[PDB]
Amino acid sequence: MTNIVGRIGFLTTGKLGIKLRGVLIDESTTPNTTYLPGIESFFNITANVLTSVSYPETETQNVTATFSIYSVDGSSNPVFPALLSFDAIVPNVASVEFDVLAPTGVVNNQLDTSALRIAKIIANDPALAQKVAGAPYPRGAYSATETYLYGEMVSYFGKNYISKSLSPIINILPTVTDSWYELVITLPESVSVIATGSDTAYGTGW
Amino acid sequence: TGVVNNQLDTSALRIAKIIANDPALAQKVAGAPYPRGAYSATETYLYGEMV
Amino acid sequence: TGVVNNQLDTSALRIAKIIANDPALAQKVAGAPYPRGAYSATETYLYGEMVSYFGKNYISKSLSPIINILPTVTDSWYELVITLPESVSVIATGSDTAYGTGW
Q: Taking Cα atoms as reference points, which of A139, A133, A146, A144 lies closest to residue A162?
């Protein structure tokens, strides 16, 4: 399920048809619903605004859907010549804007090169550069109340632990090496280093 | 002026904007420091990985 | 389950997901620091190249290559903050001392 939103220019009034390209399955309802392709769901666009676009998501099952824009006739019916038709996947998110799901010239054969170009773009715009920059991302001190993302560095018991989980972690102690890196502090050499003690005299069971 | 459309150059900008605006995808192109843990000779390390 | 016309979808979001998810294309879109080692004059440092200088880390931001220009001058380099509070390992781990075999 996704509530597509957006505005479409140069068309005060029209229809937007979404038509599936494969079989979609809704297993939520007891009799597993089977949305079949070729049947076009029509939504209104009024005053250049996507009125209410609620469509089942297709990213999970990776099913393509054709979005087409038509002018409305005298009886407000979609004249079939599609002013703008294309294929896209509805993401499994609460809301997506019609802008992002718009056709692109990047075919598979031209894939890697495109990414290459993207690199310099991200390297040029300072906003994108800071939005994507890899860094320790200082956070202050560790606390279990708030979550932590990848790369974020916290302080715990005098030690510095950098989160290394791709997923958010909450109430995970920094000492756990499976989710935190814990950079080890560099040691000076030409400094007095006599600092021992805590003579506890273990019993070979430590 | 002449007619210029230049959609192919707009495509790269659009995709870069989408990647930057999404934290999940932005994480996977983040930057050089990739934490891994304590060093061990039995594992394979990629460019930027931190030990 | 599946679609016959699987080659028709190029919708920016999909391409963004494809480029991010693939390790090779993700590595191509990297930017970021490029480690090179201790700073020295002769070495030509390109954009994003990151060096160590006087105990700090400096990433070059000059879009043009630079030579002999010190990492301290902020016109072409910028420092990578660490912000380490209440440090633990400073001198105790450095003791060792060379004596003691059996006693």
A: A139
CA A185-C33-B21 angle, 5° bins: 110
Q: Which stretches does DSSP call E strand in chain C?
A: 34-38, 49-53, 56-60, 77-79
> What are the residues whose beta carbons fall under 8 Å from the beta carbon of C6, sequence distance 6 or more?
A64
Q: Taking CB atoms and an 8 Å cutoff, what residues of chain B touch A100?
A: 18
Query: CB–CB of C3/A22 below 8 Å?
Result: yes
Residues listed for chain A: 206
What does the block give as tokens for A105?
Answer: 């010239």
Element (H, E) at A34: strand A33-35
Query: Token pair of C2, please?
Result: 């599946």
Q: Closest approach of chain C CAs to the CA of A78, in angstroms?
A: 23
Way it was determined: cryo-EM
Q: What gap in Å lies between CA C91 and CA A185, rounded to an integer?
A: 11
Smallest CA–CA distance, residue B14 to chain A, in Å, is: 8
Contact A164 B13 (CB under 8 A): no
CB contact under 8 A, A121 and B7: no
Q: Are C79 and A174 in contact (CB under 8 A)?
A: no
CB C51 within 8 Å of CB C67: no
Resolution in A, one decimal?
3.9
- Measured CA to CA, the distance from residue C81 to residue C71 in angstroms comes to 14
| C-beta neighbour count of C85 within 10 angstroms | 10
At a CB cut-off of 8 Å and minimum separation 6, what does B5 contact? none
Is B27's CB within 8 Å of A136's CB? no
How many angstroms separate the first and last alpha carbons of chain C? 75
Of A121, A164, A166, the CB nearest to B16: A121
Cβ pairs A/C, distance under 8 A? 132
Q: What is the helix (H) or strand (E) element at residue A160, kind and residue range?
A: strand A159-162
Q: How far apart are CA A150 and CA B27, in angstroms?
A: 7
Shortest distance between the Cα of B35 and any Cα of chain C, in A, equals 14
**Hunting for tokens 């991010």 — which residue is that?**
C20
Nearest Cα neighbor of A179 from A159, A163, A167, A155 is A163
**Measuring CA to CA, which residue among A53, A47, A52 is closest to residue A72?**
A47
